[PDB]
Amino acid sequence: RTCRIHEISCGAHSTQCIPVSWRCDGENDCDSGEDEENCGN
């Protein structure tokens, strides 16, 4: 991890970094499916 403050890491397995705006977009980006969960209602 240890990315910039405008980006959030995903998966916590390969330490890959994505921007925050790609939340609950419906596309499986990372290897783990944590990026499609905990989105807004």
């Binding site: 419906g26 596309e27 499986n28 499609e36």
Partner: protein
Amino acid sequence: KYKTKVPSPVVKCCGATQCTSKPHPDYQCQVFSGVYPFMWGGAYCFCDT
């Protein structure tokens, strides 16, 4: 005599989509996985199978 109308399908083609139960006479839902369509000007999206 009836007339069955078909709305435009959604193609979210990297992942999966689900529907609710809309109130309509003889309403139908289905989800078909791994279609890989081909429009004009090449294939629709990159995600194979």
